[PDB]
Amino acid sequence: VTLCSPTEDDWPGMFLLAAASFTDFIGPESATAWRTLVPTDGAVVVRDGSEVVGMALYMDLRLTVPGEVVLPTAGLSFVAVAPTHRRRGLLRAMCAELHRRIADSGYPVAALHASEGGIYGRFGYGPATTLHELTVDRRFARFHADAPGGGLGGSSVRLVRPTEHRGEFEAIYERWRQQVPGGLLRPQVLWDELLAEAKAAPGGDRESFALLHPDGYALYRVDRTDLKLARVSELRAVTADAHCALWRALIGLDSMERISIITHPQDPLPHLLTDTRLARTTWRQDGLWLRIMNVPAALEARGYAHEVGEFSTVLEVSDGGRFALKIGDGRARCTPTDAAAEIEMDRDVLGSLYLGAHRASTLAAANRLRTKDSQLLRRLDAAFASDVPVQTAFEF
Amino acid sequence: VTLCSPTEDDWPGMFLLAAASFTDFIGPESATAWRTLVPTDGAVVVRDGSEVVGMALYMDLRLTVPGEVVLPTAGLSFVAVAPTHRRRGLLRAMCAELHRRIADSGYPVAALHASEGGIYGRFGYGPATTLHELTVDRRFARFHADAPGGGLGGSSVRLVRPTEHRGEFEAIYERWRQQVPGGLLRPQVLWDELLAEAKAAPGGDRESFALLHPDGYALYRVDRTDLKLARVSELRAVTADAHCALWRALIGLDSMERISIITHPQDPLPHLLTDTRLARTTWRQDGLWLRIMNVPAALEARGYAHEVGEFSTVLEVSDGGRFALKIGDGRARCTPTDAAAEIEMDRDVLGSLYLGAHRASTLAAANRLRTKDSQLLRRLDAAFASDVPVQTAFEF
Amino acid sequence: VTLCSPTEDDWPGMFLLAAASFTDFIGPESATAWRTLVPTDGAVVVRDGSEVVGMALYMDLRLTVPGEVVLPTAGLSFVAVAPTHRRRGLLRAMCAELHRRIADSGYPVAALHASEGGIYGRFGYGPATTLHELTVDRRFARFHADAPGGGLGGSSVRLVRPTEHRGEFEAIYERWRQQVPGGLLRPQVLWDELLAEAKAAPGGDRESFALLHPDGYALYRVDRTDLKLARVSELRAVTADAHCALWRALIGLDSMERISIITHPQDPLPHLLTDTRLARTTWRQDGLWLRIMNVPAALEARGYAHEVGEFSTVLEVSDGGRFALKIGDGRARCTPTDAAAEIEMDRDVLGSLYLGAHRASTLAAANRLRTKDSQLLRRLDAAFASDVPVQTAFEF
Amino acid sequence: VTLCSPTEDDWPGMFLLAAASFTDFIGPESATAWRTLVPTDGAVVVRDGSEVVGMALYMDLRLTVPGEVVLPTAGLSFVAVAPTHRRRGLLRAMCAELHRRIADSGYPVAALHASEGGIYGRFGYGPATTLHELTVDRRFARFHADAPGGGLGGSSVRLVRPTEHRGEFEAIYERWRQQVPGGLLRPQVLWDELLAEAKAAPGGDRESFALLHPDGYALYRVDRTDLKLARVSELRAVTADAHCALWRALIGLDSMERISIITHPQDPLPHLLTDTRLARTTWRQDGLWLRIMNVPAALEARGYAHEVGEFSTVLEVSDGGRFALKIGDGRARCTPTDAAAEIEMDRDVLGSLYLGAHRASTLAAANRLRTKDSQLLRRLDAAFASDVPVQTAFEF
């Protein structure tokens, strides 16, 4: 059993492993498109001794973090171990090799979407965004008097075919992703894939439509089995007017009983309606997971809340070093030290704090971060918070 | 049709209306116990012209708000209009009369639990706490290495009969409620009621048991139909050790598949486990609703976050006046002014901000609070936040 | 933490532990009745250091094994560890103490019903009977021309109240249990309990009725929620005529859609009908578990199939010794030896073979019993088989 | 209404009748492939008077029976009567004609799979194999210490594409079918059909994968709707090592919650696991049905258990004659006699005994076989039993 970078001849075997490992396997053609984001030496395989019995790779991504800072990010994906070779340490060996390559290549952070929640914490990844499914019973939905875009005249939203307005979606999404923590740059190939998913499939998904505003769009389709459910696959809005206008149009889908969307916990939708309860949370789960590869680079690159006054502390990451951390005027300086630690946490915990989705004091209450200073906790809560709520861009 | 305070002879008619209006009607005996919290002139009825066709009352409560400040609070309850007298303006008339009496009596706030989410916003109530149901598949649940109380020796938790340890539950709960925003004083009669609900009922609920720690307790029972589900009706813990220890014991219920609890969005439970996903959010809803009766009294009484630096603004509540609001050193001063408003919101919106459950910037994104200054929004978000997360005490 | 025999003062604490551990806890009064079968020193408890945090006991039973031989049998029951004291080795300590007492008292076998299937194998217990639920859609059920009791005249079965024919049920059951492997003597107190379960409960089970034949009876009741399902709680028949007659009567329950029974895999019911498929197997599970305490006493006491010719072998039980085993003329002699083993198995595997419910060759195919001689396997299969199929008497 | 052998021009009408009669109708192309197994004069049709209103045929098969003896077997299939011509005696007429041709052609046995369980007993067919669905919750599944193939090093199983390893599956299956009662020779055309079913269908079944061992294979696919269920369509293993290894790999399908298989009642899978209950029996049904066409040829051809000592009896089959039956040294001699019968049974009952799936004493308890000698019953039980458990090859 040996570990190495795959040659072109290894890819059919990798696709076989993938097809048997991921029920949602996107298939050879789509896999090949996403492959254009995998750098040279971004992939490892494990051959028996011959067929591939393990694989993993990362893609070159661009992640927005608080303060509208964009970080090069290694996006782990296509991770699989053959059902015949479980419990043999293959995942650990593959992850170790990739992390070495990712660190040596100069990525400050790595990221992934987790197939299960109990696997990646031990490799330093913490859940950093939260997915929130809202299901609206639109038959009762009525907008509040305060909601934007309620006046007389024409509507600002248009019902369109997705493939005919690619440029407008691209430009709107590019604006969104640069200003929202969790945003990812979506390259041309991923727009090819997205629009391909928009068309109907025989025995599969129904046709997708779009609602288009100058400052926002929604892509939706009727559910394949529940014909009174419309599923919004993606809603991106850059202003409050655009967000409200798009939801007015969606609630105008009179043939539907329910509209569902995977969104974030701070989606203002419930407050747009006269009955906030109509926007039911039907599902909650971790979204993006983060491993901080370089602690000082990551902590210095991020913007911090201006409201908290300047403060200094000493942070130890359980293996990843000890640092004097000074935060003031929305910026951090993070330098080596051997002074006594005031805060301790595992590497994964820092990932969970990093985008502002989890509060330091909540993690402290579970003893995932240790300190004897509750004032320090309040300061970390406040500093690491994000002005603009953390969102999830797209799964990879 | 006339409106007045009920006499003793009106109560049988009120119980009839209640039994037909609330499927969860606690019954005459329990209603009579809760009645001991209703002040003289705390109730109104509407007679036809004779039977009672409308009723409403408030109870004298004590609500903890951020900064561990306890406010006298009028708790609206037992609100009903006969199915024969709908759409006749009875609710509006009853609420107006009660609010007048509540304001004249000197309550700074009123509160309630809403039967539906679309009714009480127009009377000035905003949802101020959030209920979060977690369902844990305990068969996979394993505690993180970091979690408290994992070492060798004896356990600190005892399995006990609720009725034999009333004093210990009372004292633990009293500690909890004084330090947590949303906490309510639970008087002797409500402990009588709680322990009465603990016993089994023929054809009804099963017997309740308790898990008792020096600094926490849990009350639970097996679900009446799903015999592999244990429902935690109440878990109150004053330290992280107590909270973890109680959950270790609950996950030790080997005869169960699932443990469910109605808790709050910042419950650290998910982070106690090696797989955070096992703590599934199965339900989300508004808890306590708040109407601020006196804006300056309420805003001055509350503690504010020390992290935000001193700032001043002008707040208009849509009918309830305009105020110069100065916040600094964790305190507010709130005085009358005719200077131009920098922030505007309806009265209900202020209730939703008041305990820290909803962010000003989220409400702004729905246009429920209007300002042209985003720095001011960040400052309000930070100031109104609560060090200790907002929780829900008990339904009334 | 200490282990000892309970005093009278320990029983309230034991009932508390029981009520919290067994959702089907029969309650103090019934527990007290079953207690009459627990010998002096038949119970152990574990106190903290004080409350009981662990308990286990055995009852004095009489088990029929093949050849209509009745063995004194220690029936483990009421086994529980507090949810607060899991993973502390309490079960292992309690089982070790009880097994020592059971062995020293002279029981050749111990037995139990398992709450879960993965717990008791490591303590030497193997599943020895198989429960088979049959559900008959009686609306299509038609008896085969060959089936007994189809001729003209009066019926031999009577519809009766269970409490008025106790003596007849007792005598029929006593005949059944003496001739069927798996049969248990049912003492007077267990008949008191059975007939008490026969009456209706407010909000609980419906009233039970009986169908009575000179050589058989059935006890049944309509399901509490599914009113078109009749559940046969117990059917005991000593002749084929009685068994068929009782099923003719049950299929005569014209108000029902379905009749269900927990029976054994060799129940002839399917073959009584013109469509064997109508007797659907809706559930399959282990029934009685057996631990052979004394290998030679147990193997010598049992009758063996006369069809297999005399043969000799050497059997090793993984800890419980090595024996020269000679089987011929339906009898075994089983003596100590140090000669090379021809068959090896763990103690639990022998329990699974002992009543004839599992074939040696099936267990060999899972490598639970090791031999290099397939002729020996065939001989063991044949010898250990039971003329009269293995059944399950009652749960304890 | 006349009955005759179909001409080429009758087949479109037969396919129409088939498409309207079998919801699982394999379609014209597949029907045409299976047709290659139908001998000249192996089919009958009934025309109105013109369209076909009835049809039936048999295929030339090779069935393995105990003692690894292979018998030519007429496999009835494609049996249908038009919904317009029910209750007209068409089935009886078609079956009578085919049985005459089958008997005259020299087949000792005929066989079928029954659409319903109440139809074929009256034509002499008895259910002779038993299908057992096991559903494994693989998330809890852990192998016993005794289970084969648990040691260190590489795995012996490979994950492969079915179409690329046809030869290896063929050879493994050929070994299996020759040594297992119930085995059927699978000709080249049926391997063409099987591998065609392996590919994905748009709006239909998902792609199939294989797990390949030198001495065994499994074919499986994810369920089309339940994406956490993997269905094993076929598992064939010639050694215990191969069977265990294949199940280790299947339980290694970490993306699945459950693995299901249609197997037989003696599958050792449950005993491979530390918790035998995890292998849940979720479904039970008759598999292959057998009609013995020639009683002495069938009874003489079969091998019998060597364990039972030589014995003689007189068997009457209700229409099919009376015979002196002598069984000894694993062989039977079966000759005509007019001596008094000691055992009587219908022809279908003998089919149910023939492969060892049903015990003579179980059938006696339902009065489906009559004798006044219980020693004789024990001898028949033992003699007709099969060393190697009866299995079901493939449906036809």
Ligand SMILES: CC1=C(c2ccc(Cl)cc2)S(=O)(=O)N=C1NCCCN1CCc2ccccc2C1
């Ligand atoms: C984009 C994508 C793939 C892909 C394919 C080829 C290449 Cl070169 C790169 C990525 S995929 O793995 O086929 N499933 C994809 N998307 C669906 C949901 C994401 N899942 C997938 C399962 C899996 C497995 C380990 C780790 C994470 C996740 C997150």
Ligand SMILES: CC1=C(c2ccc(Cl)cc2)S(=O)(=O)N=C1NCCCN1CCc2ccccc2C1
């Ligand atoms: C404590 C209680 C009552 C009560 C009874 C008598 C007296 Cl004097 C005071 C309170 S109750 O109304 O019978 N239902 C109670 N509890 C159950 C859940 C609370 N629901 C109840 C329905 C209802 C109706 C309007 C407004 C709020 C809510 C919140």
Ligand SMILES: CC1=C(c2ccc(Cl)cc2)S(=O)(=O)N=C1NCCCN1CCc2ccccc2C1
């Ligand atoms: C008869 C009986 C009990 C009993 C009570 C008191 C005395 Cl002194 C003896 C027996 S019981 O434990 O309350 N549940 C009983 N019957 C219901 C089903 C049996 N279950 C029960 C759960 C359990 C727990 C460990 C081991 C086995 C089994 C098998």
Ligand SMILES: CC1=C(c2ccc(Cl)cc2)S(=O)(=O)N=C1NCCCN1CCc2ccccc2C1
């Ligand atoms: C192989 C096969 C057919 C076939 C087709 C053409 C020829 Cl020439 C021979 C066989 S089939 O009848 O179309 N359905 C087949 N298989 C599916 C399951 C089997 N069912 C089928 C329904 C049916 C109808 C009566 C008797 C038995 C069974 C057992």
Ligand SMILES: [Cl-]
């Ligand atoms: Cl989002």
Ligand SMILES: [Cl-]
């Ligand atoms: Cl709460």
Ligand SMILES: [Cl-]
């Ligand atoms: Cl039984």
Ligand SMILES: [Cl-]
């Ligand atoms: Cl099979």
